[PDB]
Amino acid sequence: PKPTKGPRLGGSSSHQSALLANLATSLFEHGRIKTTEPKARALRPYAEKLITHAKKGALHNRREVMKKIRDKDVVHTLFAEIGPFYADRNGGYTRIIKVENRKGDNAPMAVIELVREK
Amino acid sequence: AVPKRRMSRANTRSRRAQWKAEAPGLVTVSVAGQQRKVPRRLLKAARLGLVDLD
Amino acid sequence: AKGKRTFQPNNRRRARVHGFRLRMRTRAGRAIVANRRSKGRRALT
Amino acid sequence: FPSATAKARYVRVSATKARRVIDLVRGKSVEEALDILRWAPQAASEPVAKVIASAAANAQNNEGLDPSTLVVATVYADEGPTAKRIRPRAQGRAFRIRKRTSHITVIVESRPP
RNA sequence: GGAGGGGAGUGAAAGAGUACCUGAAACCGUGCGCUUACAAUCCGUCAGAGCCCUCGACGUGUCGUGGGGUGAUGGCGUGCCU
RNA sequence: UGCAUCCGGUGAAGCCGCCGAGUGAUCGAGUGGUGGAGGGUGUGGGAGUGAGAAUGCAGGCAUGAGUAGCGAUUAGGCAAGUGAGAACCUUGCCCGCCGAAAGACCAAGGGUUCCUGGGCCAGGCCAGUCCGCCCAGGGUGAGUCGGGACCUAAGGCGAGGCCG
RNA sequence: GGCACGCGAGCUGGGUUUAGAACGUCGUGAGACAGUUCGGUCUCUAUCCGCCGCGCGCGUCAGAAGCUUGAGGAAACCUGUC
RNA sequence: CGCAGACCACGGGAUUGAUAGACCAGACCUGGAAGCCUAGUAAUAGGUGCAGGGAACUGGCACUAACCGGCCGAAAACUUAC
Incomplete structure (x- = not known):
């Protein structure tokens, strides 16, 4: 998607x-x-x-996911439950919740999770 | 460059008074019945039981 | 990058250059040992 | 006004850093000061909150005062003994490092609603 | 959590608590009073309004052979040593 | 300090104030607080007898300033655990880095740093429940390995000796 | 043309101006030469004034909000051919 | 949240919502995906098929997040003239 405007997260692009x-x-x-x-x-x-990619789950989409995920059990779950579960939801598969700051460096923390309402 | 002169107390204190912390604003919330204060930024997390209240 | 320092420890060299027997061999060394004894030094040599 | 006090001595924080946090809870009720210190993003808030809670417990227990009517009346941080360390530097020079502590005094008192 | 503290005790005294006789200065706070955000200040000194405190006398506030704190404002004013 | 007098646990000195005093250094057998054992006065005797400055010395503490820096050229993430407390400790799964090394084994040097259990004020450039840190206990087994008891090199010491 | 012949806590280090070496010349010599030749460490985290930007506070006689006048300042000002 | 930005400030939105993300479509960049079939001994080529993949741009779309929320913040009078 949109690249980060400023310096990359881990200290480099890779x-x-x-x-x-x-x-x-x-x-x-x-x-x-x-x-x-x-x-x-x-x-x-x-x-x-x-x-x-997992929602319209074909072989092409599966290979598209595998060129990023690299873990095969997660790919299987993504294409067997997660994809079908979000079949009739158009976007907004995740939500972000802000939680208390870390103690060692006062880093703002957040929780990201998959929506499970419907 | 090095300081040419020793600071007077007035100047030192006037500049030093700017190093301070602001008080976070707190809003009420009901978790397990009892009311308690929480920052508004964490209201949703508190309502979801994701923030530890001592 | 030549970072060799002056002190290179070696115990046999220390004993053969400053040890008790070398001090006792010569008159000046015996005077040194006597002076260190009179000063009260714990380690005479 | 009836009152109770508590003192934390030789707390291993510098007095200025403690004062930065103390300047947030002066003249406030004990419960609201405790909340402010609970949500303050500073390391000095834990010792100060402990002193304030200890003073409130002293007031409730030893003098039998109502906790709901307690107010942080007086609070300040003094300087404790400071230990001297040495940080070696470039080209053989050695600098002095100070390890400062502080004493924190809190006085709560009962005031009518 | 401890450290530390608050009650309670010991002690003639804890303003003697094994960081311990006495506990000065520099230095760092907290509280109260006066002052300070149109102002060019060797930071004082001489006049000095206003505010606050205090001692006497008479009424209820108003002077006095008064006293202290702070000082808006005006005049003067080129740190010490060698 | 000689001599003579006076004060003192019914509170000396020292210290901090108030109220006063002298032409000056200064004074207050005027007073309040703190304190806890020695002081004052007169008249003589003797000085380690007076600091503001020597880029003076020792101790304590400011200013710069809650500022610089937090020590390479690899990189960390998540879940679970422990715990008062976890970015850093444990376990798992990933990811990355070295790989004529950043792997393995000796010599010199170091000296108990090794293991087990415990700890968390000091130290660790943050935190720390962890540690090469602190405490206790334990741990090093040789006819053949490296040395001596075998041999000599350079060189050292050197019976007598020569020289001085 | 002035302004430390403006400007190295803004830069350079070619020249001049240490220590090495050589030529000519001078000196018995060590050496020397407003003579030549080759080589030769340019340190600093900005306290104050100054200046470039950006905020916080108070004031402008109630508390606010739109749109503005402008005292006063700053910028710009070149020129050719057909 | 922003084409506003060191921080701050500025600007916009906040369910009476298109602010950002996702999703759908377009624009644009790349250049013909995978799988299958066919041809060839093979390297490889052709068809399916302007294919597939994709950031910033434009338009739709409340699916996700803008929340059952806190803190600030409004008037001494008097004089004269009309």
């Missing part, structure tokens, strides 16, 4: 790409993760577009 991939894998594996607020803000569109 580290940011790996960070986003790992965070998306963790989110799809657990359903909700806790991290710094800017990380979740960057994670939302990335994970949502992966879910969009």
